Amino acid sequence: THRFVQKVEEMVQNHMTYSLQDVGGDANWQLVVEEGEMKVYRREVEENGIVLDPLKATHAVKGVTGHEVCNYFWNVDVRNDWETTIENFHVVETLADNAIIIYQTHKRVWPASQRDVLYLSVIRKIPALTENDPETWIVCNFSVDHDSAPLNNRCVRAKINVAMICQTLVSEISRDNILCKITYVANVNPGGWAPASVLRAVAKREYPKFLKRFTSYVQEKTAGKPILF
Ligand SMILES: Cc1cccc(-c2n[nH]cc2-c2ccc(F)c(-c3ccc(S(=O)(=O)CCO)cc3)c2)n1
């Protein structure tokens, strides 16, 4: 039992309560980009001059399970196969077999300075709320403080709360008959000065490119392997 067990429970339950809700019907969410079943939405939010724009996306991916998608998203050993904006990353602390603390730096977005981030990354299976409902696999990545935080004078420290939340629908089961329903939420505080139009333009381009590249990577690596439910 590590020191972040309560915090983890809170952050995960908040996503389970609030992040799964539908936004198709909700005019407070702007639909920014659509590519088939991938639907990317945002709200435009600025606090004390800093652009926070909550991002929420849904997607439906054939032929992979939620457990698989979450394992690929959490497993630091495959990070470089799908990430494209990371410059450096270091595992700061191992809390449990399902929870680590990561420090990473990102590629600069001109003309703002580079960003770094220091977060707890946890993977959990959440049982079905009623006998009717699906089980959920979730990865939550959320900023924390740590005394071994790196000094990096080129970087402004962002703060994140991200979740990759998956429910899996199925019909001996073939990958032909499985579909993973994803909700991805990203609440990024850039942590200092950054021009709003540029941040918005980069979010609009990069979030869809990330979701497409990541989800296709999982399909590619699990093809012709036995399913892990
Ligand atoms: C996916 C995406 C969308 C929009 C912009 C960018 C980007 N381009 N250049 C710098 C960044 C940047 C700056 C600060 C950050 F915290 C993250 C950040 C993004 C996602 C996540 S995660 O938790 O989804 C995946 C683990 O990295 C963590 C940090 C990314 N990347």
UniProtKB/Swiss-Prot annotation:
* Reported tissue expression: Widely expressed.
START domain sequence ranges: 1-223
Give the top-rank taxon of the lineage listed in the UniProt record for this protein.
Answer: Eukaryota
- Provide the protein's localization: Cytoplasm; Golgi apparatus; Endoplasmic reticulum
Outcome, altering W110A:
Reduces affinity for membranes. Abolishes ceramide transfer
Modified how: Inactivated by hyperphosphorylation of serine residues by CSNK1G2/CK1 that triggers dissociation from the Golgi complex, thus down-regulating ER-to-Golgi transport of ceramide and sphingomyelin synthesis.
* Record: residues binding an N-acylsphing-4-enine: E83, Q104, N141, Y184
Known role: Shelters ceramides and diacylglycerol lipids inside its START domain and mediates the intracellular trafficking of ceramides and diacylglycerol lipids in a non-vesicular manner.
Q: From the record heading the sequence, give the disease linked to this protein.
A: Neurodevelopmental disorder with hypotonia, speech delay, and dysmorphic facies: An autosomal dominant disorder characterized by mild to profound developmental delay with hypotonia, delayed motor skills, impaired intellectual development, poor or absent speech, and behavioral abnormalities. Some patients are non-verbal and non-ambulatory. Additional features may include early feeding difficulties, poor overall growth, seizures, brain imaging abnormalities, and dysmorphic facial features.
Print the domain comment field.
Answer: The START domain recognizes ceramides and diacylglycerol lipids, interacts with membranes, and mediates the intermembrane transfer of ceramides and diacylglycerol lipids. The PH domain targets the Golgi apparatus.
Assembly, per entry: Interacts with VAPA and VAPB. Interaction with VAPB is less efficient than with VAPA. Interacts (via FFAT motif) with MOSPD2 (via MSP domain).
Spell out the protein name for this chain: Ceramide transfer protein
Q: What taxonomic lineage is listed for the species of origin?
A: Eukaryota, Metazoa, Chordata, Craniata, Vertebrata
